[PDB]
Each structure stands twice: as structure tokens, then as C-alpha cells.
């Protein structure tokens, strides 16, 4: 875990998440997918403490899938993000809190709008045009402040995202082994295989 | 500072040293040469505490150059390594010790033999066929135990060295931005520009 990025453009939300799983002085894996599909039009990436990350992600996934079956209906990204925030807000005052930071990228089918939410382990939610967790933000936020425009296409967003990854690969101390990029839009969730 | 390697082959000593200079969450430089020529046939690479490394390297360089001028004669790699060890052995019981680990690759012109010495900040000297400092050794020593042969050529040594760098680039957590490779033989010291 380390690098998770998110960019909301005109018609989609793009999430980029690093592939490295490092422990001690060994990179144990270089193809790790740090994300879970919560619903057909909602994707959550995650980063933080080992074990907690996946355990939390899958726990949320199960709950949203349970809701979908019960109501035969897909929760809005806003509704999902509020549910996730509350779980983390409960967690922070537990005996052992979930040390997990997340981005929630979703496409609201009722509004026909992409939505990106950034939530940290404390339960601090914000809706953003672009987001990041960990040290990534210290490079990417200023970069995006400059190059981002709200009316960009998915292709323009991917080029903007390449610019972030290049900067991180240049200036970040650790080798994060590239990123897995996924797009969330009106047609659901798909993975970019060549990045 | 992080990765410094050394391989003694039949007719030469090959030193590989990482190019990254990292501080905090920023790679400040990716072309740093972590070595000093002590004499025409003696090269020292170094790694450790910031500031100490260069300050120590240049201090040793000055002393060996002073000796060379005084006697109009080049000290043997063995003699240089003993001088360096003693300086570090003094240093460790000083008010503020030099936190610097070094490899000394030299070609003894009287013996017509390449020589590689590994010395840590405590003043612990060993002559070796192949050496490393820091976490590098944890991967490279076992690799070299398997693939190294004492009668190898310089070209075979460089291929053996590529195998080390590839393994480090695969399994090391940090991005060390490749290595600068230098060869020490009967004709002196030269740098491999394409590695």
C-alpha cells in the first residue's frame, strides 16, 4: 500500500492505484489490485495498514452487495460514501481502529454525473475533482491544480494521470511498481490494461 | 546513499554504486557519483550518513594524493585499505564518528592482481571476491555465491553485475535510480557510460 489517486472528469471517474506490496526490504508482489467493486457503478480504492485495508474493503463490499440484493436497487455514490464514512467514524473510537484510507469513485445514474469522494481513516469525507492519499498528494495536488480542467474527457484525464505517475516515478523515494488504472462511467467499471 | 557493490574478477575490480540521492519524500538527484579516485589504480565507493560520506571520502583522497606527491610513488591497495581502516577505527571512538561504509577496489601493479576490500564504519576490514554494503548484500551475496567464478573476465563480471542490479530493481523497496559502474585494472580507472 502507498499510492492511490483519483480524478473526476466530465463523464467519468478515474482511479489509479499502485501495484507494489512491500514488506521489510522485500517487494513481495508487483501486480496487486488495491480496489474493490462495491456496486456496478461504484469503485473503492484503499491504502493503509496491512490486513486492515482488504478486511475493511471486503466488509464494505459485502454490505453494499447485501443492500443491492435486498432492495433490488443500486445505492448512489453519495449514499455509499456516507455509509463508508460512518463505519470509519465508528472505527476510530473502537478498541482497534481500521487504519485505512479510501477513495470512492462512482457514477450516479440518476444525476448522470461522475463523483469522487476522499475519506481518511478518521472518517473525514470530502467530495473532490481530484484526490490522493498518503505522500502522493504532496506532488499530485499542485500538478493537478495547474493542469486540470473540469470539462476534460476520459482520454484527457488519462493523459493528466500519466503526468502524475511520471512525476511520482521521478521524485518518490520508493519503487511502487506502476499503477492499475480503472474508469468508472455510465457503462460501469472497466480496467485499462496498458498503462 | 544506499547501494554500493563490488566484484573482483581475474584481471579487474568492478564497483557499482547507486545514483539516487534521496531526502525525505524527494529524490533530489538521480546522477550522483558515490566514489572518489584515491590514486590512479585505486578507487573508493562509499555509503552512509549524509555529509559524512563525501567529507570522509575527500579527506582520504587528499591524504593519499599527499602521500603520492611526497614519495613520488603509488601506495598499494592493501596499504590504502589499511590506512582507511585505521581512520575509521579512530573515528568510531571519537565524539562524533564518521558513519560511512566503503568499498576499496584497486589493482596492485607490483603483484599484477585486482583487490577488493570491504570496510564498515566501525573499521571492520575484509578482503573479498565480491562485496556489498547495506541491504544490497542480503540479495547479492547469495546470487554471487551461485553465479560467481574466480577466473571470470571483465565482460563476464559486468554481466554478473547486471544480474545483481536486475534483482535489486525487482525486490528492493526503494527506487535507487540505477548505478554508475567503474572498472579498475592494470590501465587504471574507467567508467562504463551505458549501464
Amino acid at each position: 500500500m502507498d499510492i492511490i489517486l483519483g480524478i473526476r472528469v466530465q463523464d467519468s471517474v478515474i482511479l489509479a492505484s499502485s501495484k507494489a506490496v512491500t514488506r521489510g526490504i522485500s517487494v513481495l508482489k508487483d501486480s496487486d489490485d488495491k480496489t474493490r467493486q462495491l456496486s456496478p457503478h461504484t469503485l473503492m480504492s484503499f491504502a493503509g495498514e496491512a490486513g486492515d485495508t482488504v478486511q475493511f474493503a471486503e466488509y464494505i463490499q459485502a454490505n453494499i452487495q447485501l443492500y443491492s440484493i435486498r432492495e433490488d436497487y443500486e445505492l448512489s455514490p453519495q449514499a455509499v460514501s456516507s455509509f463508508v464514512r460512518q463505519e470509519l467514524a465508528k472505527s476510530i473510537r473502537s478498541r482497534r481502529p481500521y487504519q485505512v484510507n479510501v477513495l470512492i469513485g462512482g457514477y450516479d445514474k440518476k444525476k448522470n454525473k461522475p463523483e469522487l469522494y476522499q475519506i481518511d481513516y478518521l472518517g473525514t469525507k470530502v467530495e473532490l475533482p481530484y484526490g490522493a492519499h498518503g505522500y502522493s498528494g504532496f506532488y499530485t495536488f499542485s500538478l493537478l491544480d495547474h493542469h486540470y480542467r473540469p470539462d476534460m474527457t476520459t482520454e484527457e484525464g488519462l493523459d493528466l494521470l500519466k503526468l502524475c505517475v511520471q512525476e511520482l516515478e521521478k521524485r518518490m523515494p520508493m519503487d511502487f511498481k506502476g499503477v492499475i488504472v480503472k474508469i468508472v462511467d455510465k457503462d460501469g467499471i472497466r480496467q485499462v490494461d496498458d498503462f | 546513499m544506499d547501494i554500493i557493490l563490488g566484484i573482483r574478477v581475474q584481471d579487474s575490480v568492478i564497483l557499482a554504486s547507486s545514483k539516487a540521492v534521496t531526502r525525505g519524500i524527494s529524490v533530489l538527484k538521480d546522477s550522483d557519483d558515490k566514489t572518489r579516485q584515491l590514486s590512479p589504480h585505486t578507487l573508493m565507493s562509499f555509503a552512509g550518513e549524509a555529509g559524512d560520506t563525501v567529507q570522509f571520502a575527500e579527506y582520504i583522497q587528499a591524504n593519499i594524493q599527499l602521500y603520492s606527491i611526497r614519495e613520488d610513488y603509488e601506495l598499494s591497495p592493501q596499504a590504502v585499505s589499511s590506512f582507511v581502516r585505521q581512520e575509521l577505527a579512530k573515528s568510531i571512538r571519537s565524539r562524533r564518528p564518521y558513519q560511512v561504509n566503503v568499498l576499496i577496489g584497486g589493482y596492485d601493479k607490483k603483484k599484477n592482481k585486482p583487490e577488493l576490500y570491504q570496510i564498515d564504519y566501525l573499521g571492520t576490514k575484509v578482503e573479498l571476491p565480491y562485496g556489498a554494503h547495506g541491504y544490497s548484500g542480503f540479495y547479492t551475496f547469495s546470487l554471487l555465491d551461485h553465479h560467481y567464478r574466480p577466473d571470470m573476465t571483465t565482460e563476464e563480471g559486468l554481466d554478473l553485475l547486471k544480474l545483481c542490479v536486475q534483482e535489486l530493481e525487482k525486490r528492493m523497496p526503494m527506487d535507487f535510480k540505477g548505478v554508475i559502474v567503474k572498472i579498475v585494472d592494470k590501465d587504471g580507472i574507467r567508467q562504463v557510460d551505458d549501464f
Binding site: - | 575509521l88 577505527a89 573499521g123 571492520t124 576490514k125 575484509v126 578482503e127 548484500g137
Partner: protein, 204 residues
């Protein structure tokens, strides 16, 4: 960060009939990482042998220091230093650094050239002399060596038999210690000949 157990290593010395033996392992490591399998811990100044375990930089430094001192001794005295005298020199030199000591476990071994008597001695890091008829042990597997020597040892062994006893003491002690081993050397010392043997041992 315990200076005496960073590099690892062991030394053992024994007496026999008109002879002495001193042996050491060859490992030098940095905690878990084995670095060198050629690091000998036994040195000699004339006919007096000195083994040194502990922090490797201090092993090297003290060797260079005692070579320095025994060379000046010989120039002024016009004779080689004896084991009993050298033992006192080691003790004085170590205690000189009482409140900033060398982290070592030295072991003197040799035969007095005048009397012909076998002599061994051990020290702690600050110079306390530990003289013994039978054996001296030192290093990270000293407990193991104490157990091996105490059971295996018997007095008045012949040089060839003594070799077997000291070797088995070191080998089996080393194999129960993570930081010791990686090869071994044994010195058999008679009045006017010295044999040096490298032992075959497991390399893990």
C-alpha cells in the same frame, strides 16, 4: 547493538603433554548476514600465540597493537617475548582502557622456550587474567565450549590426540551457535614445530 555479538566468533585453547593447541572459527558476519568465511582470529608474535574473539575491528586493532609492542620488546630485550610475559602485557594494555574498553575476549597460548612448560591464559574485555591448566574458551559460543571442553578434556593428551579433542570441542560448540562456524582453524604447537590445520565443518 551488543558489541561482543555483532560479528560473532569463537576461540578455544587446550594444553597437552609437552604441547598446546589453540583453535578458532572463520566466520565474520554483521548480525544475521554472513560476510566473510576467511576471518582468522588467531595471531602469533614469535612463538607466542594470541586468539581474539569479539568485535572484529578491535580484534584487528589489538593484533596490530601487540605486533607493534612485541616488535619493540624484541628490539630492546634482544629476545622473543614469552607467554607469561605477553599475558601480563595483554592485561596491562586492556586495563589501560578500563572506562572505554576494547570489546574482546583474548586467549594467549604458547610454550615457554626456557622451561618448556605449556601455557594458556584467557581474559575478559578489561584485562582480568584467567589462567588454567586445562583449557580456555572465548566467544559467542563460550557456554557451548565450556560444556564440550569440560566433558571431552583429559590431561596429558598427545599432540595427535589433543588435536581431535580440541577440534570436536570447537566444531560441536560452533554448530549450536548461529554466529559461529563457517570454517575452522586449529594450531598444534610443540616445542619447536607448529602445525596448522583447517577443519571441514558444516557451512550453515
Amino acid at each position: 547493538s551488543d558489541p561482543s555479538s555483532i560479528n560473532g566468533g569463537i576461540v578455544v585453547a587446550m594444553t597437552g603433554k609437552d604441547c598446546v593447541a589453540i583453535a578458532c572459527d572463520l566466520r565474520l558476519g554483521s548480525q544475521s548476514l554472513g560476510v566473510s568465511n576467511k576471518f582468522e582470529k588467531i595471531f602469533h608474535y614469535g612463538h607466542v600465540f594470541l586468539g581474539i574473539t569479539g568485535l572484529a575491528t578491535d580484534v584487528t586493532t589489538l593484533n596490530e597493537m601487540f605486533r607493534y609492542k612485541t616488535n619493540l620488546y624484541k628490539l630492546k630485550e634482544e629476545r622473543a617475548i614469552e607467554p607469561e610475559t605477553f599475558t601480563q602485557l595483554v592485561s596491562s594494555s586492556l586495563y589501560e582502557r578500563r572506562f572505554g574498553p576494547y570489546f574482546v575476549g583474548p586467549v594467549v597460548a604458547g610454550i615457554n622456550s626456557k622451561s618448556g612448560k605449556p601455557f594458556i591464559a584467557g581474559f575478559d574485555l578489561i584485562g582480568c587474567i584467567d589462567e588454567a591448566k586445562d583449557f580456555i574458551v572465548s566467544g559467542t559460543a563460550s557456554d557451548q565450549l565450556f560444556g564440550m571442553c569440560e566433558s571431552l578434556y583429559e590431561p596429558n593428551l598427545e599432540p595427535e590426540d589433543l588435536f581431535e579433542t580440541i577440534s570436536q570441542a570447537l566444531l560441536n560448540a560452533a554448530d549450536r551457535d548461529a554466529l559461529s562456524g563457517w570454517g575452522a582453524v586449529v594450531y598444534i604447537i610443540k616445542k619447536d614445530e607448529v602445525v596448522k590445520r583447517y577443519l571441514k565443518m558444516r557451512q550453515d
